Short mmCIF file of C-alpha atoms in Angstrom, two decimals:
data_model
loop_
_atom_site.label_atom_id
_atom_site.label_comp_id
_atom_site.label_asym_id
_atom_site.label_seq_id
_atom_site.Cartn_x
_atom_site.Cartn_y
_atom_site.Cartn_z
CA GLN A 1 -3.20 -24.08 -5.62
CA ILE A 2 -3.69 -20.46 -6.09
CA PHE A 3 -6.40 -18.07 -6.35
CA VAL A 4 -6.87 -15.44 -9.20
CA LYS A 5 -8.87 -12.56 -7.85
CA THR A 6 -10.64 -10.03 -9.84
CA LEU A 7 -12.20 -6.49 -9.26
CA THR A 8 -15.76 -7.82 -9.23
CA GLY A 9 -14.31 -10.56 -6.61
CA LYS A 10 -14.80 -13.47 -9.07
CA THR A 11 -12.35 -15.48 -7.22
CA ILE A 12 -11.40 -18.15 -9.81
CA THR A 13 -9.01 -20.88 -8.45
CA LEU A 14 -6.00 -22.28 -10.29
CA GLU A 15 -3.71 -25.27 -9.77
CA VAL A 16 -0.40 -24.96 -11.01
CA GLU A 17 3.07 -26.01 -10.01
CA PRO A 18 5.81 -23.66 -8.83
CA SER A 19 7.97 -24.60 -11.54
CA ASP A 20 5.21 -23.52 -14.06
CA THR A 21 5.85 -20.36 -15.82
CA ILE A 22 3.31 -17.27 -15.85
CA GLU A 23 2.82 -18.14 -19.72
CA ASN A 24 1.18 -21.27 -18.58
CA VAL A 25 -0.89 -19.26 -16.13
CA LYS A 26 -2.16 -17.09 -18.91
CA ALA A 27 -3.01 -20.35 -21.11
CA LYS A 28 -4.74 -21.66 -18.22
CA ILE A 29 -6.55 -18.51 -17.41
CA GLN A 30 -7.48 -18.75 -21.19
CA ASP A 31 -8.95 -22.18 -20.50
CA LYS A 32 -11.12 -20.77 -17.50
CA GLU A 33 -12.04 -17.23 -18.97
CA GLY A 34 -11.62 -16.58 -22.60
CA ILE A 35 -9.12 -13.79 -22.46
CA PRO A 36 -6.03 -13.43 -24.77
CA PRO A 37 -2.53 -13.67 -23.01
CA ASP A 38 -1.26 -10.41 -23.89
CA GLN A 39 -4.27 -8.65 -22.34
CA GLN A 40 -4.05 -9.87 -18.81
CA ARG A 41 -1.97 -8.39 -15.93
CA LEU A 42 -1.20 -10.26 -12.90
CA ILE A 43 -0.48 -8.59 -9.41
CA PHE A 44 1.00 -9.91 -6.36
CA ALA A 45 2.40 -7.94 -3.26
CA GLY A 46 1.96 -4.73 -5.61
CA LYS A 47 4.57 -6.37 -8.09
CA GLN A 48 4.08 -7.17 -11.72
CA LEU A 49 4.37 -10.74 -12.91
CA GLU A 50 6.56 -11.32 -16.11
CA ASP A 51 6.10 -14.09 -18.88
CA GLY A 52 9.62 -15.66 -18.49
CA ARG A 53 9.48 -15.90 -14.93
CA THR A 54 8.12 -18.82 -12.73
CA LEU A 55 6.25 -19.02 -9.44
CA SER A 56 9.43 -19.94 -7.97
CA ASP A 57 11.20 -16.72 -9.27
CA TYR A 58 8.72 -14.59 -7.19
CA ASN A 59 7.54 -15.61 -3.74
CA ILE A 60 4.34 -17.35 -4.98
CA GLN A 61 3.63 -20.80 -3.06
CA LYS A 62 0.38 -21.78 -2.08
CA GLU A 63 -3.29 -20.36 -1.40
CA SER A 64 -1.88 -17.22 -3.15
CA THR A 65 -4.42 -14.60 -4.27
CA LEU A 66 -3.41 -13.35 -7.63
CA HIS A 67 -5.10 -9.99 -8.59
CA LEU A 68 -6.14 -9.80 -12.39
CA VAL A 69 -6.52 -6.73 -14.19
CA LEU A 70 -7.52 -6.58 -17.86
CA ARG A 71 -6.75 -4.03 -20.66
CA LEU A 72 -8.73 -2.79 -23.62
CA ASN B 1 -27.76 -8.22 -35.47
CA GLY B 2 -25.38 -9.96 -33.10
CA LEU B 3 -24.54 -7.04 -30.56
CA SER B 4 -24.54 -3.51 -31.87
CA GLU B 5 -24.23 -1.16 -28.92
CA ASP B 6 -27.41 -0.86 -26.67
CA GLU B 7 -27.14 -4.30 -25.19
CA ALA B 8 -23.37 -3.68 -24.50
CA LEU B 9 -23.90 -0.14 -23.32
CA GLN B 10 -27.04 -1.08 -21.12
CA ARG B 11 -24.71 -3.34 -19.29
CA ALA B 12 -21.64 -1.15 -19.34
CA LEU B 13 -24.02 1.43 -17.58
CA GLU B 14 -24.91 -0.99 -14.73
CA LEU B 15 -21.37 -1.94 -13.81
CA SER B 16 -20.05 1.46 -13.40
CA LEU B 17 -22.70 1.99 -10.66
CA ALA B 18 -21.36 -1.41 -9.18
CA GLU B 19 -18.03 -0.26 -9.64
CA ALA B 20 -16.86 -3.58 -11.12
CA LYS B 21 -14.83 -4.59 -14.30
CA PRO B 22 -14.27 -8.20 -15.10
CA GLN B 23 -17.97 -9.18 -15.39
CA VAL B 24 -18.47 -6.93 -18.52
CA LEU B 25 -14.79 -5.67 -18.72
CA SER B 26 -16.26 -2.23 -17.78
CA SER B 27 -13.52 -0.14 -15.99
CA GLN B 28 -10.00 0.52 -17.15
CA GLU B 29 -6.68 -1.13 -16.46
CA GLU B 30 -6.00 2.65 -14.97
CA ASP B 31 -8.54 2.19 -12.18
CA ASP B 32 -8.07 -1.56 -11.84
CA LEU B 33 -4.33 -1.25 -11.37
CA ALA B 34 -5.25 1.18 -8.30
CA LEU B 35 -7.43 -1.39 -6.72
CA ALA B 36 -5.62 -4.30 -7.68
CA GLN B 37 -2.32 -2.89 -6.32
CA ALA B 38 -4.04 -1.34 -3.35
CA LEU B 39 -5.44 -4.87 -2.58
CA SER B 40 -2.37 -7.10 -3.50
CA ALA B 41 0.01 -4.58 -1.28
CA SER B 42 -2.57 -4.27 1.53
CA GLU B 43 -3.60 -8.01 1.47
CA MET C 1 -2.16 18.05 13.59
CA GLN C 2 -4.39 15.70 11.63
CA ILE C 3 -4.55 15.35 7.79
CA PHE C 4 -6.03 13.09 5.36
CA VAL C 5 -4.98 10.89 2.48
CA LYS C 6 -7.33 10.09 -0.26
CA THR C 7 -6.91 7.11 -2.72
CA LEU C 8 -8.47 6.93 -6.07
CA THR C 9 -9.81 3.58 -5.08
CA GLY C 10 -12.18 4.98 -2.40
CA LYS C 11 -9.94 4.17 0.87
CA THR C 12 -9.45 7.36 3.08
CA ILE C 13 -7.23 6.96 6.22
CA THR C 14 -6.77 9.83 8.94
CA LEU C 15 -3.14 10.35 9.95
CA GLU C 16 -1.34 12.19 13.07
CA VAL C 17 1.28 14.26 11.85
CA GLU C 18 3.24 17.38 12.55
CA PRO C 19 4.35 20.40 10.33
CA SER C 20 8.05 19.67 10.65
CA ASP C 21 7.75 16.06 9.53
CA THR C 22 9.02 15.21 5.90
CA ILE C 23 7.08 13.68 3.05
CA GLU C 24 9.07 10.42 3.38
CA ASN C 25 7.79 9.89 6.96
CA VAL C 26 4.13 10.62 5.77
CA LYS C 27 4.73 7.89 3.08
CA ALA C 28 6.12 5.65 5.60
CA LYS C 29 3.23 6.37 7.88
CA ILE C 30 0.85 4.95 4.99
CA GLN C 31 3.11 1.89 4.91
CA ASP C 32 2.45 0.82 8.67
CA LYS C 33 -0.98 1.92 8.13
CA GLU C 34 -2.26 0.04 4.97
CA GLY C 35 1.03 -1.92 3.61
CA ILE C 36 2.33 0.00 0.75
CA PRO C 37 6.03 0.91 0.32
CA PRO C 38 7.27 4.32 -0.07
CA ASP C 39 8.63 3.62 -3.67
CA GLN C 40 4.89 2.92 -4.69
CA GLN C 41 3.44 6.20 -3.62
CA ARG C 42 2.83 9.36 -5.28
CA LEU C 43 1.24 12.15 -2.81
CA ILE C 44 -0.47 15.03 -4.57
CA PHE C 45 -1.27 18.42 -2.78
CA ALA C 46 -1.96 22.06 -4.11
CA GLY C 47 -1.46 21.20 -7.76
CA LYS C 48 2.05 19.89 -7.34
CA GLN C 49 3.22 16.22 -6.48
CA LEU C 50 5.26 16.22 -3.45
CA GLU C 51 9.10 15.82 -3.11
CA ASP C 52 10.48 13.47 -0.48
CA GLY C 53 13.11 15.41 1.34
CA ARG C 54 10.72 18.36 1.97
CA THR C 55 8.12 18.84 4.73
CA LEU C 56 4.77 19.61 5.09
CA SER C 57 5.46 22.96 6.22
CA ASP C 58 7.27 23.65 2.77
CA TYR C 59 4.19 22.80 0.97
CA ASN C 60 1.96 24.62 3.17
CA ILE C 61 -0.39 21.76 4.33
CA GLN C 62 -3.10 22.93 6.88
CA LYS C 63 -4.79 21.10 9.58
CA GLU C 64 -7.83 18.76 8.47
CA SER C 65 -6.18 18.88 4.72
CA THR C 66 -6.60 16.30 2.01
CA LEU C 67 -3.41 14.93 0.35
CA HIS C 68 -4.36 12.85 -2.59
CA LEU C 69 -2.68 9.51 -3.31
CA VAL C 70 -1.68 7.48 -6.34
CA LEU C 71 -0.14 4.06 -6.29
CA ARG C 72 2.98 3.77 -8.73
CA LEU C 73 3.80 0.45 -10.41
#
C-alpha cells in the first residue's frame, strides 16, 4: 500500500508489491487517472524513480507517499 | 465544438490562483518539481 | 547576523549565520532545518550562483539579506 500525492493534494492510493516495477506503477496510475506513461514523474526522498527499477531497488516499503509531477 | 479554448482557459485561469496543477494540469514540471522535491525531501 | 533563504515554492526560513561561514555550512544549515541534502541546492545571490568553498563575506551578504534557493534534481 503506497500513496501517490499530487501538487493539488489529490492523494490517490495504490496497492502494489515491492517486486513490482515502476513501469507497472505507471500502468496502474493509467488505470486510475488517464495519463500516458512517458508523461509522469514520481518523486520520493527527492530522488527520481526509473522504469527498470522496482520498489525494492529504492527504499520504498509501505504507506509511502509518492509525489507525482506531470509534463506537457 | 468539443473544446476550443475559453472553457480550457477559464479553468486554467482559476487554478493559477489556487496554485494547483493536476486537477487541470495547469502548472509546469518546472514549478511542480520544486514543490514535489521540496515536499518529498522535507516529508 | 540573520539572513533569509527564499524558495520558489513559497517557503521562507530565517537563518542564524556569521560573515565568516562558508556556503556549504549555509546549505547544511538548510538540511537540518528543512531536510534537503547540500547536493540538491542552488543558492543564488547578487546575480551570481554561489560556490561552495567560499564564504558569505566573499559574496558580500549583508544582514537581513535574501538568498534565493532552487532545488536541483
